[PDB]
């Protein structure tokens, strides 16, 4: 199975995967009956906006990512999400911390690992004040508030090739977070391995993106 | 493949699946590891509504039925579809004529076999009337608005579990359309077939239906 | 309330809007308070893709319409439909018969004037049939099966005007058939009436049809 | 504008509706024409599961609330959002501090006034380290990764009855987290408000939670 390390402890995680450029072709012809005029016919439905097709290639992925990606991530309404609970489980004691590199670019009166001490320091601070409530009875639901945006999260997503196009377009980009850049150049890769007829199509005639090729 | 004939020319048939009753338990656990608690959890999630772990198990079906049966089908928001087109393709000859059974439980002044017969006529003069404007150049969009709503369509139909289990509700079901019911009980038929767990669990907790059991 | 004439005897009708322009901006700044700078935001978020605020603009339309142009409409997922039902009532003796102008461009070898004429016999002898299937003790359900599909139907549509913009794109565009374009004509003129600010953005930027403006 | 005050700083306003009780009627009927029988159609619609009539009523709430409730909130697909940015903007000294009242029932081996103190204590220095590092240079996005989770956000929320129907079921219930049931009681309250004959529906046939009415 396709697993990708992502920013220091993150992964992107392929689980399964339905159908493949064919499915799409089969679809949009409903064809009864199970080469250069399927992938012909995936560049047309591509350059001219017939995406439905697309919708019958779906792929389930596990993911561990901040929670300050998560929240960007679970905008993207049609998909599937089940995720780790902070209500009903004790929450792990991992944390994203920025690389000094993370910093390139931006002139900082503070060194940048100096920030990324800072960074330890309040977010070890946080975990001790959480397992100290905890450990005192407070119920877990309560307790987990004070926990910081870059506590790691972890989650299942199943999303269909379609409604990936769109995660790319909007995350495979400069625009977005440099952090869910990162995981949307996994998801790329994954949906590149899976699908090369679709994932091509998409590059030449519908990425909106700027990071993509 | 699983392929069950509906009426009497239509067909519900498989054509692909992701997952399986331990896909709903993966992703609701959100484990990492790929059975007496398996099936205490699915009985669980089906008995308190947490109905999004279902979303992670997704169907592909192929379906040939009549454009009536179609339009109920298609209202059913939450799924994918992609259908034969009467602007792009001639249509063929092929109409659901009810069987004389079909009228069961009602009192009819014309005989049930005398019904088949008036149904038979106009199909037969609507076709014709379409045919004759296709070969006079009439465009196709426009030739079959001839035609009538018990002509046969055909469709892929992608649809997660849950939206599946919503469709059973409300198609297997004595309110819903006799014609559509048989379509629903195939379908229904093919869910307990892949999902054993899923499907009994919904029958004995969720199902709001009539028919199924 | 604005009401348009489409077809020969079809209309679009709004029925009800929720907010204008405005909500779009006071939604994108997450606004407390109740222009050229609101302007420049919205042609921003048009440039951009940045389309959710326009989700916070919904309106309610009534369409009359034959049931071939509803098929296609009805593919719209991202809205709410409530349609007249053949199941629980008696239908309408009303047809959509297209006008000899229809087949300008096209060569027939039959008068567009016989086409009007072989249109309106076939749909008087099923309508007929349909009366005489009914007038016999037929459920009415089984006996609408032989009316055909420029049968007029009539439904209410509630929609957001980010799905509108979706549904112009597609139907407001030479691509789609004729008919629903006429319709879609007719949606953009109250688009345009009740938003001109964001109408006049999405022409500019994000409309991707060749017929609007 | 009804406002209610929720938690110590949070809120729920209404910005703007469409539609009403009879909204429901009118698309359910299709009704060209703009009570007993308005009544009973909307119980029977309730009792029986023909929800899609109550889509055609919308609501746009603006709500601020912590981040842990607004990530259980924004799981509620069936709906639009636009929050505030911890990228683009710089965000406001403003977290959620439970009352002492908030550990009614759990026995702590720390007094419930200590553990409201533990809470602001680290929220002081999270918030103090967030803000050295936007004053060193760091870059908002990376900088507020240091916040904990009971920072208040605020957002737009578009929802239609049908969904607010499905958000009530499940968070105003005893089964969801403390903090925002007190967001569903007073979304409830305002539902009632401007809706009431489909709110009183609701509790009666198709209310599935454990504390309205
Ligand atoms: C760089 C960037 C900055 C952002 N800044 C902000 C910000 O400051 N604040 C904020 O709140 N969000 C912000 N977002 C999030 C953004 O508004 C979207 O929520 C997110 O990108 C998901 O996009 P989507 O709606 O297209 O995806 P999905 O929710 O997956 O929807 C997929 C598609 O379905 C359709 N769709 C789905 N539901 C509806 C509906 N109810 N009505 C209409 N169409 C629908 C649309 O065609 C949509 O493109 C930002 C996103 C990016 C990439
Ligand atoms: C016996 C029967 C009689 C019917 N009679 C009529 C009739 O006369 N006229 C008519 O027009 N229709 C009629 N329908 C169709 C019906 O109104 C629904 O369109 C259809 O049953 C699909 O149901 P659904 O909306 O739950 O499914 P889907 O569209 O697949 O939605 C699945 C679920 O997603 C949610 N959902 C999806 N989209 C939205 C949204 N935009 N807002 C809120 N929630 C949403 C709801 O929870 C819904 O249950 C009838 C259906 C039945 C079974
Ligand atoms: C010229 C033309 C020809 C067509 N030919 C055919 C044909 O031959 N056969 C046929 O079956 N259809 C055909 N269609 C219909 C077409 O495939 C679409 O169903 C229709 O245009 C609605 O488009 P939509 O999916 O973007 O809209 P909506 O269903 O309203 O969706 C709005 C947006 O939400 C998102 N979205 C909604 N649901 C999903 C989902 N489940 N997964 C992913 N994204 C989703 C997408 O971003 C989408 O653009 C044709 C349409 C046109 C305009
Ligand atoms: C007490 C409680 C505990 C929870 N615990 C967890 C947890 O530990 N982990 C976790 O990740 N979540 C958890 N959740 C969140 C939960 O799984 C849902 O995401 C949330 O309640 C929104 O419910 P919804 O899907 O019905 O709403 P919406 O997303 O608004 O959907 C409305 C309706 O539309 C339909 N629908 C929408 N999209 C789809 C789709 N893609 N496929 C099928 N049907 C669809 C369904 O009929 C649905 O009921 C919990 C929720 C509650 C109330
Ligand atoms: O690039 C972005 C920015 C904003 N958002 C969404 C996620 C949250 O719902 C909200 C604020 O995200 P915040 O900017 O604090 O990361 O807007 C998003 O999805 N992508
Ligand atoms: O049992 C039903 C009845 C109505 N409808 C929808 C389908 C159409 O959009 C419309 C009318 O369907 P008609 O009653 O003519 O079969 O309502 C439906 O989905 N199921
Ligand atoms: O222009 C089009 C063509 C096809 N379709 C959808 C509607 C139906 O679900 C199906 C066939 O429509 P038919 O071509 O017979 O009008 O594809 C559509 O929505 N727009
Ligand atoms: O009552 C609940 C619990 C869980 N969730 C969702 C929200 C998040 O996406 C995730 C974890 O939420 P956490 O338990 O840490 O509050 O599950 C939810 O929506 N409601």
């Known amino acids: 199975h396709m697993k990708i390390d992502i920013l220091d402890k993150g992964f992107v995680e392929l689980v399964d995967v339905m159908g493949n450029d064919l499915s799409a072709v089969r679809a949009a012809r409903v064809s009864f009956d199970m080469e250069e005029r399927d992938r012909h016919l995936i560049e ?44 009903y489980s004790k929450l792990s004691y991992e944390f994203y911390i920025p690389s000094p590199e993370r910093l390139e670019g931006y002139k900082t009166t503070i060194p940048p690992e100096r920030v990324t001490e800072k960074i330890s320091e309040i977010v070890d601070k946080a975990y001790r004040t959480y397992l100290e409530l905890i450990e005192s009875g407070v119920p877990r639901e309560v307790a987990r508030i004070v926990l910081p945006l870059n506590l790691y999260t972890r989650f299942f997503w199943t999303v269909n090739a ?11 980009d400069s625009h977005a977070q440099w952090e869910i850049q990162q995981y949307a150049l996994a998801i790329a890769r994954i949906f590149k391995e899976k699908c090369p007829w679709t994932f091509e199509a998409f590059l030449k005639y519908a990425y909106k993106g700027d990071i993509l090729k």
Chains 1, 2, 3, 4 share one sequence.
């Open 162 to 172: 379609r409604s990936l196009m769109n995660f790319l377009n909007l995350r495979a």
């Open 44 to 87: 047309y439905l591509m350059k001219h906006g017939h995406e439905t097709p697309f919708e019958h290639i779906v792929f389930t992925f596990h993911v561990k990512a901040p929670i300050f990606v998560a929240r960007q991530w679970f905008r993207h309404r049609i998909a599937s999400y089940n995720e780790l609970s902070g209500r």
